[PDB]
Amino acid sequence: LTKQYEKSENDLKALQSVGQIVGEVLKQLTEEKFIVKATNGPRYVVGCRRQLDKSKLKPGTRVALDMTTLTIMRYLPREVDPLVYNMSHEDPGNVSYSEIGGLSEQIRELREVIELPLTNPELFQRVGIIPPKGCLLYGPPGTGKTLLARAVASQLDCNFLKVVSSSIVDKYIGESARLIREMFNYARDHQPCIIFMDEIDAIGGRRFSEGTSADREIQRTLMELLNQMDGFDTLHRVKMIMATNRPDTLDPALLRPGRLDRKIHIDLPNEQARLDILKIHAGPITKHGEIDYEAIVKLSDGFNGADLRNVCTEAGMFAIRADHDFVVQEDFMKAVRKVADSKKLESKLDYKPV
Amino acid sequence: GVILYGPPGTGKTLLAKAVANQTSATFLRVVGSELIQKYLGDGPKLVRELFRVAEEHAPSIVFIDEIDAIGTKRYDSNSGGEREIQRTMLELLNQLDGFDSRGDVKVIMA
Amino acid sequence: MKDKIKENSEKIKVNKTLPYLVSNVIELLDVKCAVIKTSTRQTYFLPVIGLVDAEKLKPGDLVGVNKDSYLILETLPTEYDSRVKAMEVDERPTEQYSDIGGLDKQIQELVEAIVLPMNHKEKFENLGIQPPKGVLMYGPPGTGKTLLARACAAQTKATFLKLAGPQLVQMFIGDGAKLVRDAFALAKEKAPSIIFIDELDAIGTKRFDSEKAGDREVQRTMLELLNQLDGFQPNTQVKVIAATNRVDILDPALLRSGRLDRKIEFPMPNEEARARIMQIHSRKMNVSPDVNYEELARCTDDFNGAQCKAVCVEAGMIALRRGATELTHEDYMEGILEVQAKKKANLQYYA
Amino acid sequence: IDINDVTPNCRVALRNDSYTLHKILPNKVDPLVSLMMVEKVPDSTYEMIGG
Amino acid sequence: DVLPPEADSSIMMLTSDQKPDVMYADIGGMDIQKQEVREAVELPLTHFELYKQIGIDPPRGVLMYGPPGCGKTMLAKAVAHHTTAAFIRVVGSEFVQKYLGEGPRMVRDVFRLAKENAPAIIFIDEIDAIATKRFDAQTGADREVQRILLELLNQMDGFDQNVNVKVIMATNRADTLDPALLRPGRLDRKIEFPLPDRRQKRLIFSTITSKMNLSEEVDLEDYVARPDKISGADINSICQESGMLAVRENRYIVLAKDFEKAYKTVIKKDEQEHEFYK
Amino acid sequence: QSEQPLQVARCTKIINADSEDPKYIINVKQFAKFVVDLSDQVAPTDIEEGMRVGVDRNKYQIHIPLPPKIDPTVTMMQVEEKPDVTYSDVGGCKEQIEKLREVVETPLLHPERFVNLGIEPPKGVLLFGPPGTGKTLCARAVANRTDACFIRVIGSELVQKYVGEGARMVRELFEMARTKKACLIFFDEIDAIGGARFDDGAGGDNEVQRTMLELINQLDGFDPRGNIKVLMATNRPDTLDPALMRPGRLDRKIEFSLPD
Amino acid sequence: AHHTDCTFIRVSGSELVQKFIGEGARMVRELFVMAREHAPSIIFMDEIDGDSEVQRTMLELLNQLDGFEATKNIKVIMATNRIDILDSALLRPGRIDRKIEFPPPNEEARLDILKIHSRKMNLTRGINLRKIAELMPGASG
């Protein structure tokens, strides 16, 4: 094939090419001398190609250097970290707000920070207030903190950095604090942007006064994140969502209003909220006969959203056990009682920010 | 083993000093408070190393002065609390009389 | 041109010779071009990708590059920790559900949550219900928790990732979280898969607020496991079994009804079960046809499955002690005394 | 280079390939001196003490 | 070759476009803190001879500490905005780098660049990242951070009275700081930024509400007089949420009801104290 | 000249093992990671994933498989010089010794008497009693008489500074015990790490409990333990965890009461 | 220490200075290696004010200095806020050979301290430092 020869010939020309060392321009000494620093390496006094612009080589610019002569080939755009890339390109799952029940009050508070200020900036400038930038979703486990984050990421047309705080921790010296810097650098370069940090107590816990070396490295990551949310350089058009079910352990600086402006309490569902969530999860379930959702609600006191889905799941497995293709109210009645027995093994959940 | 006990100032360390003056064996002196370390396992590790030096310099006399100070004094630098001190003691129990064969090491505690 | 193509491919084989320097793709720029980070901790810019289509590369992709020119020679498989790969069982233990006595309800409650969704996925789609996510087996020691896990691995063709709690507790920060998110990554690629976490309380200890010190590293590993059980990305292809002896220690977010949907209480074996257990572990043993396992079950109140098995093991000890080739009911009777481990007493003045 | 002048905790220059000790570099800061720089106790004399 | 002193510095000074928009007048009710910073940072920079004539030894560094939200970082923004001297802004977490030696290296570039561009102000926010009093010699993190702090102490010790460089360090956890950092000659001026008092509260309320379209029916003394121990960030949040409710109701004027709701939401103080104790 | 030096590397993945060009990804400690091919003087079936290998410095081709890495402290735990104490030096423990011997000595000396009868002898003995009652004395007699590998492990030796390190040493301890046909592990003063699990709000003894949880896992977990017959001595058996004091981990509980 | 040419060593127990004391750092008596090399030496610990680590260091140094130290001229100083908080071990006779009290300066002593620190300032002639001393009852130096 003629096209096959072209692909093989393009391969041969590719083989002759050589990789180029990636660095960063520190200062332009002369019209032909530059000071650059390798990404993880020493600093060199290098030259530059004559064909290069040499005005785009401002200090801090990422550059590619020859392996032998270390001369600058080209200026590269700001590097996006592979971990930060996975944060932006993280599939929420196409979650709609119609899949969240009883959190209409809490949804509106969340959208008042991340939706309206990013679309109508002049509305808030008119009153004389800078819109809140950070929001904390806290509550007992299973109440819908991550689901609300997925719904916001799925529905809101904005740049979104989704990350779990335990997934940023790296054993290398200064890597975890570097990842936070890259997260906000990506957000600053892609305004408007939203950073959702799930399980913030992984790195955002209270700073220890007598901790270990591992703790100190995490606290440096925390206070690096603190410096980005509210520090010397003002964060513009970057909103932050933080979710945790143990906000009592968080640092006071993290919970300070200047950083986490709104503390939205995703509480356990009430009688109406439990009814809403039950219909959400029992909807797709095949059933004959009248289903008294109020009867299940009355025995669902103390349940979260996860239990109400388990009640729907267990009721189906009762039907599977009886070789039934449908679920009756009696199947739900055992399921809600069975789940209620499992709630005795769960310890205290009422934890609030201090 | 031998332990010297009594009211303060009664001559417990003095007799050990007299022992160290007229001994042909290596004399190792460690105050009991020196076995409280700032890190977990270091206290047990130190008791293990102290009798390891005693093994090398056989015959030897190990003087654990103020042995009671390891438990009667609580220091915030000791990460593990009374539980780490107990593990330090359990290492000390093995060294005095344990599985490993003990050479010519005589232990004096005060 | 055929000779030119074949001669061209010969020149590739010289440059494509091993060893390759393992690297990770960092970026894919346009002015078609790639940035890679070598395992020697070096960041390089490649004006041309190499011998791999730029469309088939994504950030974080493991690639093997030329040791000298650092040009991407091939794509590499996804990288999983050797510790995570070493906890995937390949021997597939030879246990059976008939080797477990007195746990029929517990076996049913686990099989219909771990095995039924994998095989009969239609029973859940027609009913419109989501299959249970996570099964926790809790109870007193010796009640047969990891035994059922072995039987689960025995009677299942799915990938099984046996694991213990202390294995996820690592010195370096983020190492344990990497293992947790690598076990689920490896399990996802080998779906259907079952992940068994024995001694869950090693990592699942409840979080707490402290001002001086605490085990935040393990709480970070647990928080990673919470995300893998139920987090931002819903993983509905890896079944998770967990076992613990003290469920009161476990963090409430771990015992959630989305992470561990079914919490099975393993009870102390009752009189019928204890006789069944002693019968289970006496099959390979020359036992005389007069042993009243009903009487032994009555003589072993507050015995777990391990003690009931130990009764059979100690019974052969006494038979060998007296040189018998057959075990008698008396050998079982005072083999109960050994397992009972009652302290020596001169209580002959009673009655 | 005299072996008697090679004292412990001395700075020395070693050749590139053979690593041969060929020069006794000026001694580094005394660890006690370095310890007292970070503590930085103000120097005092009897003239600056009153009462 | 010998390179120019301003060259080879991974940390750059503040450009004119990077100067924060925060004024001194933007800050409300910090006269004690404003005076001490002025007397210890910006006045010695311009009146070094008047200090020498009087006999005062100017403080080489200033430590700003207090509860979070009490105006530490913002005063540095105001100082950087209102200064004729160079400003080098940094946070201690950046010093900890993967490449061993790059931390202590980039510490001395900050001080070398500041020395070459004198008068200059070095601001190191979140100093606890590299100034913790505990160090584990078997961990590379604490071994490297120990090098960073030792270089930081060495650099400040290496400044005589002639070099016109002032260092500002800010932390809300000064209890965790190494005592060697607070020795004379390194940080001789410790300024506390406490929770605002009642008089401080009404100045913070007045300065933030001055930029907001309030109604004449709003009496700020109702919320100032409350016994809640709140910070400037709390007061900013109260006013910020007050305009949030006005925006929600498609309004541009904040009435008293918005302030009442915003105050209740922002504070949200659980009682945490039982009446039988008093 | 003839014997080149070999760099220690760990195999991570074998690519296309079925074909005639099997490619091995190796992790050369702190140096780098290389995709290499196997040397022609070793068999393809001799290299498995996750196993340490020896590689040359030029093409990094795997030249020799290597034993699994064991902590030097764990390696020093095995007894090399047996004690000078026999069972004749233990008095008043006649019943105690026979129970001790028939679990820890008889199965290894005469294994034929148990396989024929389908008997699985107990793989664990707990010696408990007041101090001075002969708990370590009997274990010293066991090590003197035993012919298998004997490993003495003091519980305070398993307490380590870092998180998860104590459980690591338990893993490598049983890993190295499994490299022997028959082995004996002695856990003197197991109350150092064998304490019962609890929740005191703070993380009280959480790290040490994990070491105990690892020891429990190796004794009786998903994987078979092996031919290891463990032996623990403690003067505070009331403090031990119920899971550790369960048959299958400590099958025999031999009490060293004060002599009659 | 300045007037006697004795090397002054401040022992704060800081882990920042442990790399200079010694890589071991298992005992505070590892300081004696660098103290002997600089004899005469004065080891000074100040109690800023669990049990006190400065007091614990004092005991360990005093035990070695009792009769187990070969080199002489190694003196040890402790500074404390109060003497009744001291351990019974340090308060035991024979351990601390002299206890020196530093009462807050009275009216005359405050004048001397005032006369000392005011020299470093450009003072107008005729300052009544006596009156300022009277204006500061119960003040420290």
Ligand SMILES: Nc1ncnc2c1ncn2[C@@H]1O[C@H](COP(=O)(O)OP(=O)(O)OP(=O)(O)O)[C@@H](O)[C@H]1O
């Ligand atoms: N309000 C709700 N409406 C509908 N489903 C809900 C609701 N709250 C929770 N759920 C269900 O609960 C399950 C888990 O909830 P989610 O992942 O949001 O937990 P969470 O609040 O983040 O808890 P955790 O504290 O464990 O992180 C999901 O399957 C979701 O459908």
Ligand SMILES: Nc1ncnc2c1ncn2[C@@H]1O[C@H](COP(=O)(O)OP(=O)(O)OP(=O)(O)O)[C@@H](O)[C@H]1O
């Ligand atoms: N019986 C004695 N004969 C002579 N001198 C004695 C006698 N008892 C005590 N002393 C003197 O007392 C000094 C201090 O006592 P010493 O250090 O021996 O105390 P101790 O018994 O070890 O007690 P402790 O450590 O509890 O304070 C000794 O240096 C010695 O000179």
Ligand SMILES: Nc1ncnc2c1ncn2[C@@H]1O[C@H](COP(=O)(O)OP(=O)(O)OP(=O)(O)O)[C@@H](O)[C@H]1O
């Ligand atoms: N119900 C049972 N039927 C049969 N055998 C049983 C039963 N329960 C326990 N056993 C036996 O107990 C021995 C060990 O028990 P296993 O470790 O499986 O239980 P576990 O509850 O998971 O233990 P642990 O709580 O200590 O982790 C096995 O040999 C197994 O055969």
Ligand SMILES: Nc1ncnc2c1ncn2[C@@H]1O[C@H](COP(=O)(O)OP(=O)(O)OP(=O)(O)O)[C@@H](O)[C@H]1O
């Ligand atoms: N006196 C004040 N007047 C006006 N606003 C104030 C005042 N004090 C604090 N603030 C508010 O504080 C917020 C930022 O807090 P700032 O960074 O100054 O505090 P900090 O002490 O440095 O914080 P942290 O210790 O958490 O790092 C601003 O939004 C500002 O409105």
Ligand SMILES: Nc1ncnc2c1ncn2[C@@H]1O[C@H](COP(=O)(O)OP(=O)(O)OP(=O)(O)O)[C@@H](O)[C@H]1O
């Ligand atoms: N039954 C015995 N027969 C002979 N000598 C004995 C006996 N029991 C103890 N001894 C002697 O007493 C000493 C006590 O040490 P041993 O190691 O036996 O104590 P232990 O029971 O392990 O104590 P601890 O619980 O404190 O560790 C032995 O070294 C031995 O010399």
Ligand SMILES: [Mg+2]
């Ligand atoms: Mg969640």
Ligand SMILES: [Mg+2]
């Ligand atoms: Mg004494």
Ligand SMILES: [Mg+2]
């Ligand atoms: Mg088990």
Ligand SMILES: [Mg+2]
């Ligand atoms: Mg700040």
Ligand SMILES: [Mg+2]
């Ligand atoms: Mg013993």
